[PDB]
Amino acid sequence: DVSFRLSGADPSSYGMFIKDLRNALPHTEKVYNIPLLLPSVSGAGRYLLMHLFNYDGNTITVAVDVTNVYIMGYLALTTSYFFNEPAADLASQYVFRSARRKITLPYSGNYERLQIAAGKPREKIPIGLPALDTAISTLLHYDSTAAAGALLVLIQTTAEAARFKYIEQQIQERAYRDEVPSSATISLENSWSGLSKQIQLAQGNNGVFRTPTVLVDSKGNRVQITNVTSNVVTSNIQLLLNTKNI
Numbered sequence: 324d325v326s327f328r329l330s331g332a333d334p335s336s337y338g339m340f341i342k343d344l345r346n347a348l349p350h351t352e353k354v355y356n357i358p359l360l361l362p363s364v365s366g367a368g369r370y371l372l373m374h375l376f377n378y379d380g381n382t383i384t385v386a387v388d389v390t391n392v393y394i395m396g397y398l399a400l401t402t403s404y405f406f407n408e409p410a411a412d413l414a415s416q417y418v419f420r421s422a423r424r425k426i427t428l429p430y431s432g433n434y435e436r437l438q439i440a441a442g443k444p445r446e447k448i449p450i451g452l453p454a455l456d457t458a459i460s461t462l463l464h465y466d467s468t469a470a471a472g473a474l475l476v477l478i479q480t481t482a483e484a485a486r487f488k489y490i491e492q493q494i495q496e497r498a499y500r501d502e503v504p505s506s507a508t509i510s511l512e513n514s515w516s517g518l519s520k521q522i523q524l525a526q527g528n529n530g531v532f533r534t535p536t537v538l539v540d541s542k543g544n545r546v547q548i549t550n551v552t553s554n555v556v557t558s559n560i561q562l563l564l565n566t567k568n569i
């Protein structure tokens with residue numbers, strides 16, 4: 324398991340949590356030096372447990388699919404909650420079996436469905452460490468509209484931060500003040516899968532991408548990623564989604 328506490332949290336301990344979150348994910352190959360996530364893992368070992376503690380010391384445990392860094396659901400006191408999706412339903416046969424009930428949320432984990440449930444796109448949802456504190460607190464007592472938005476915070480401050488160093492850095496800047504994510508942040512989130520694919524495909528194409536990727540950059544500019552010498556590949560991405568899951 325990995326575990327982050329918001330009390331005493333500062334950019335340092337957050338970064339160290341995000342470091343642990345990346346290191347808990349297993350892999351047997353790096354591709355251009357980037358850990359490559361497994362095509363699949365079997366039974367309970369597919370699932371990473373994150374213990375998260377809000378500023379007051381209350382806690383949820385979040386189950387993460389180690390092959391893709393998707394949140395399956397979480398344990399809040401004695402009630403387990405899981406997205407309405409086959410993967411999460413699978414996950415529920417291995418994690419938090421001893422919860423007193425299990426609730427299935429009325430949406431999948433997809434950013435699109437979570438946005439409808441929340442009634443606002445990610446662009447307009449502040450994120451940061453204080454926002455991650457709100458979100459932990461929310462998920463402690465069921466409320467599905469509120470949870471949509473608490474989960475969109477949670478995905479971005481954990482999973483999306485572990486995937487990209489840039490988004491980890493965006494969170495660390497917001498240690499004490501929330502802020503809507505930059506467009507570049509939405510851009511990377513949306514591109515994770517195509518980047519993972521084109522990183523893997525570059526490797527017998529002399530590090531050239533078969534299909535270029537369009538991103539927005541940190542300065543709000545549209546930019547095009549064409550091979551593995553780009554900063555996105557060299558510095559930014561930290562985990563690759565296996566093409567055997569794309």
Ligand SMILES: *[C@@H]1O[C@H](CO)[C@@H](O[C@@H]2O[C@H](CO)[C@@H](O)[C@H](O)[C@H]2NC(C)=O)[C@H](O)[C@H]1NC(C)=O
Nearest residue numbers: 529530531532547548549550551552553554555
């Ligand atoms: C791989 O992508 C790099 C960009 O990171 C390409 O080099 C860039 O492309 C043109 C010049 O050819 C310029 O717009 C950029 O300023 C270049 N940037 C840097 C930092 O060199 C490179 O051409 C691509 N590789 C191939 C074979 O096309």
Ligand SMILES: OC[C@H]1O[C@@H](O[C@H]2[C@H](O)[C@@H](O)[C@H](O)O[C@@H]2CO)[C@H](O)[C@@H](O)[C@H]1O
Nearest residue numbers: 392393394408410431432433434435478
């Ligand atoms: O979309 C971002 C969101 O991905 C979810 O994955 C969705 C997937 O994109 C969609 O095809 C399907 O309906 O549900 C998937 C979940 O199994 C993740 O669940 C979530 O954590 C974010 O990564």
